[PDB]
Amino acid sequence: DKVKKEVGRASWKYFHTLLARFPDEPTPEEREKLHTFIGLYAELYPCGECSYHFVKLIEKYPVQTSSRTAAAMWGCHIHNKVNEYLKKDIYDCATILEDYDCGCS
Amino acid sequence: DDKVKKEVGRASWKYFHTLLARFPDEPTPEEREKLHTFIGLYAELYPCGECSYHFVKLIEKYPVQTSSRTAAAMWGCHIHNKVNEYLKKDIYDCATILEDYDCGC
Ligand SMILES: Cc1cc2nc3c(=O)[nH]c(=O)nc-3n(C[C@H](O)[C@H](O)[C@H](O)COP(=O)(O)OP(=O)(O)OC[C@H]3O[C@@H](n4cnc5c(N)ncnc54)[C@H](O)[C@@H]3O)c2cc1C
Ligand SMILES: Cc1cc2nc3c(=O)[nH]c(=O)nc-3n(C[C@H](O)[C@H](O)[C@H](O)COP(=O)(O)OP(=O)(O)OC[C@H]3O[C@@H](n4cnc5c(N)ncnc54)[C@H](O)[C@@H]3O)c2cc1C
Questions:
Q1: Are B91 and B85 in contact (CB under 8 A)?
Q2: Which one of A2, A11, A17 has the shortest CB-CB distance to B47?
Q3: Which residues of chain B are within 8 Å of residue A31 when distances are taken between CB atoms?
Q4: Residue A100 belongs to a domain with what CATH number?
Q5: How many angstroms does the Cα of residue B83 sit away from the middle of ligand 2?
Q6: What is the sign of the dihedral through the CA atoms of B54, B33, A37 and B11?
Q7: Could you give the number of structural domains in chain A?
Q8: Three-class SS string for chain A?
């Protein structure tokens, strides 16, 4: 439970930062890459029950790849779906883009 | 700024090594291809421009080993050490790479 949670926190941090650095105006190939990436991300997540649940979640909520804004909002919303499932607080997605600076800007 | 980049990197590696350690001991051909495709996208989408370019070149030089989670995890330790080497950081002992990142699942 301890390790599972630590892996989870690290993964979300990476996840949200990745989406926040996606282009504002991606090319068709970049959109496809993000789409393919998310599918594999869900399938390979290092937790059986987590992966099963996430695969089902992205089927209901396909990643929005048209822009950095859409992608980041999508990420916050899907993370909140997991929060709902786990009886955790619902995160305010209002400043999602600013919450995950890459330190690369 | 610099702290952000470090925090994102630490989280990313934690996720990365745990994902590899959770890969099957005996993957199917399709699972091996999924990991191969995933790593390529992981490198291309990393949230830091210079880092992404550097890593893309690294995985081209050191292709991901997908025959088993043992081979994949060892490959992960080796490639992370190449980044350590480039950044003049200490080299991590890979002897217990699987146990180091148990999924706690
Ligand atoms: C893809 C994925 C699927 C998972 N599925 C499950 C599951 O099915 N079952 C299970 O037990 N565990 C699951 N986990 C684990 C779980 O989501 C948690 O990571 C873990 O329980 C630790 O919770 P936490 O309370 O520390 O915060 P986390 O949920 O790990 O949050 C990290 C932090 O990010 C912020 N945050 C919270 N919500 C959001 C949001 N909506 N958008 C942006 N930032 C947010 C907060 O600052 C918070 O402290 C999964 C993790 C991932 C990464
Ligand atoms: C794909 C990727 C590419 C990156 N490229 C660059 C880059 O080009 N330039 C730049 O400035 N930054 C880059 N970074 C960031 C950098 O690698 C570090 O994450 C960061 O500098 C913080 O370093 P750290 O000393 O805290 O430990 P990190 O290197 O983040 O290590 C995390 C921890 O994992 C363990 N660890 C160390 N080595 C290994 C290993 N070989 N195998 C398994 N576990 C290990 C240790 O317990 C350590 O504390 C990248 C990160 C990723 C994830």
A1: yes
A2: A17
A3: none
A4: 1.20.120.310
A5: 7
A6: negative
A7: 1
A8: CHHHHHHHHHHHHHHHHHHHCCCCCCCHHHHHHHHHHHHHHHHHCCCHHHHHHHHHHHHHCCCCCCCHHHHHHHHHHHHHHHHHHCCCCCCCHHHHHHHCCCCCC
